[PDB]
Design an enzyme around this catalytic site. Structure first.
Site, short mmCIF file in Angstrom:
data_model
loop_
_atom_site.label_atom_id
_atom_site.label_comp_id
_atom_site.label_asym_id
_atom_site.label_seq_id
_atom_site.Cartn_x
_atom_site.Cartn_y
_atom_site.Cartn_z
CG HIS A 45 -0.35 0.13 2.52
ND1 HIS A 45 0.23 -0.92 3.21
CD2 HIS A 45 -0.25 1.21 3.34
CE1 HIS A 45 0.66 -0.48 4.39
NE2 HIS A 45 0.41 0.81 4.47
CG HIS A 84 0.03 4.48 4.51
ND1 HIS A 84 -0.64 3.74 5.46
CD2 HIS A 84 -0.87 5.39 4.04
CE1 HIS A 84 -1.88 4.18 5.57
NE2 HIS A 84 -2.04 5.19 4.73
CG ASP A 110 4.93 2.89 7.06
OD1 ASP A 110 3.96 3.25 6.33
OD2 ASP A 110 4.67 2.08 7.97
CG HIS A 111 4.61 0.09 3.83
ND1 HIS A 111 5.33 -0.80 4.59
CD2 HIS A 111 3.66 0.60 4.65
CE1 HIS A 111 4.81 -0.86 5.81
NE2 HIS A 111 3.79 -0.03 5.86
CG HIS A 132 -3.52 -0.39 6.39
ND1 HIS A 132 -3.38 -0.19 7.75
CD2 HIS A 132 -2.49 0.28 5.81
CE1 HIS A 132 -2.32 0.57 7.97
NE2 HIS A 132 -1.78 0.88 6.81
CE1 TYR A 149 -5.59 4.15 9.51
CE2 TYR A 149 -6.95 2.59 8.30
CZ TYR A 149 -5.77 3.27 8.44
OH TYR A 149 -4.72 3.06 7.58
CG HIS A 195 4.52 -2.63 9.71
ND1 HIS A 195 5.42 -1.66 10.10
CD2 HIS A 195 3.58 -2.00 8.96
CE1 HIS A 195 5.03 -0.49 9.62
NE2 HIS A 195 3.90 -0.66 8.95
O1 LIG Z 1 2.19 -0.38 12.12
C1 LIG Z 1 1.06 0.03 11.76
O2 LIG Z 1 0.06 -0.70 11.58
C2 LIG Z 1 0.84 1.50 11.50
N1 LIG Z 1 2.05 2.27 11.58
C3 LIG Z 1 2.28 3.40 10.92
O3 LIG Z 1 3.30 4.04 11.14
C4 LIG Z 1 1.28 3.96 9.92
C5 LIG Z 1 1.61 3.59 8.49
S1 LIG Z 1 1.25 1.85 8.11
N2 LIG Z 1 1.34 5.40 10.02
C6 LIG Z 1 0.85 6.03 11.08
O4 LIG Z 1 0.31 5.45 12.00
O5 LIG Z 1 0.97 7.47 11.09
C7 LIG Z 1 0.31 8.18 12.15
C8 LIG Z 1 0.63 9.65 12.01
C9 LIG Z 1 1.96 10.05 12.08
C10 LIG Z 1 2.27 11.40 11.97
C11 LIG Z 1 1.25 12.33 11.77
C12 LIG Z 1 -0.07 11.92 11.70
C13 LIG Z 1 -0.39 10.57 11.82
ZN LIG Z 2 -0.07 1.85 6.26
ZN LIG Z 3 3.19 0.78 7.69
#
Ligand SMILES: O=C(O)CNC(=O)[C@H](CS)NC(=O)OCc1ccccc1
Ligand SMILES: [Zn+2]
Ligand SMILES: [Zn+2]
EC number: 3.5.2.6
Length: 266
Positions: free
Chosen positions: A83, A85, A87-88, A159, A190, A224
């Site tokens: 997806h 986002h 981080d990917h 997601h 969410y 992840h």
């Molecule tokens: O591991 C997981 O399932 C989710 N972890 C994440 O980092 C996700 C992307 S998959 N991003 C996030 O939570 O961003 C939140 C955010 C960060 C900065 C500003 C607003 C919102």
């Molecule tokens: Zn994500």
């Molecule tokens: Zn992620």
């Protein structure tokens, strides 16, 4: 006089940014990302494929790992995404500039990637990254073949609208290994119920649990790695504790049901 706040960078756990050497999963498939973000290289006689690239600042590290594997910038033909986002898909734009790679993605992922992850349905502009264009749009169940490795797209919206599982068959000991790279089934922070930007979010997640449960799945990998109980820093036993797709789907649904109840209470 109180000024507006400074922009806040998307900062992450150190392990997500910790370089690792290539870790072999199967005969043509390697983890080449960091300890805590997946980036899969699939190497064939007719070029290479990258599935995800992690965070934006991982671009050079991916290229170094590719070179260690014998994959030159010209050899990289295709980038696929779980997806879009930060981080990917973070380094996708940079990788396109520095290699021969073209991006194939579904329409939802392509639109989000083209926005650099801005105007996210849940995160707004909190996690933006350099935008990139898709070169090919894929439909659900569409196959893409590189050097005889056949990648099938399985849409698993939730997601993100464009969340996809990619499946392919590799080998390990002359025996087939059906690999399922299943996307996130989390909904971190969410609003699930009555969300005007995603009215059918809950039904899409339920359908996606079923899709994931049913994937061809000798080995599950996730963006992840912790989500599927992989430990990339554990060397020879990195994948020993990995969940089945069935178990991953079940855990995700149980968590999702818990989150729904917490949301109703909150
Ligand atoms: O591991 C997981 O399932 C989710 N972890 C994440 O980092 C996700 C992307 S998959 N991003 C996030 O939570 O961003 C939140 C955010 C960060 C900065 C500003 C607003 C919102
Ligand atoms: Zn994500
Ligand atoms: Zn992620």
């Amino acid at each position: 006089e109180v000024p507006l706040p400074q922009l806040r960078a998307y900062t992450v756990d150190a392990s997500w940014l910790q370089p690792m050497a290539p870790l072999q999963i199967a005969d043509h498939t390697w983890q080449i990302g960091t300890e805590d973000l997946t980036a899969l290289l699939v190497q064939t006689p007719d070029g290479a494929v990258l599935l995800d690239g992690g965070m934006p600042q991982m671009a050079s590290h991916l290229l170094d790992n590719m070179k260690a594997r014998g994959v030159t910038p010209r050899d990289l033909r295709l980038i696929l995404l779980s997806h879009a986002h930060a981080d990917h898909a973070g380094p996708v734009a940079e990788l396109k500039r520095r290699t021969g790679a073209k991006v194939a993605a579904n329409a939802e992922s392509a639109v989000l990637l083209a926005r650099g992850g801005s105007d996210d349905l849940h995160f707004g502009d909190g996690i933006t990254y350099p935008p990139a264009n898709a070169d090919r749009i894929v439909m659900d169940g569409e196959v893409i073949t590189v050097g005889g490795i056949v990648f099938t797209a399985h849409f698993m919206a939730g997601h993100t609208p464009g969340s996809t599982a990619w499946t392919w068959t590799d080998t390990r000991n002359g025996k087939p290994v059906r690999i399922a790279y299943a996307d996130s089934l989390s909904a971190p922070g969410y609003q699930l119920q009555g969300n005007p930007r995603y009215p059918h979010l809950i039904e899409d997640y339920r359908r996606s649990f079923a899709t994931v449960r049913a994937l061809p799945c000798d080995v599950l990998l996730t963006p992840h790695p912790g989500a599927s109980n992989w430990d990339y820093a554990a060397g020879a036993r990195a994948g020993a504790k990995a969940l089945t797709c069935k178990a991953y789907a079940d855990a995700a649904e149980q968590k999702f049901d818990g989150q729904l109840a917490k949301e109703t209470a909150g």
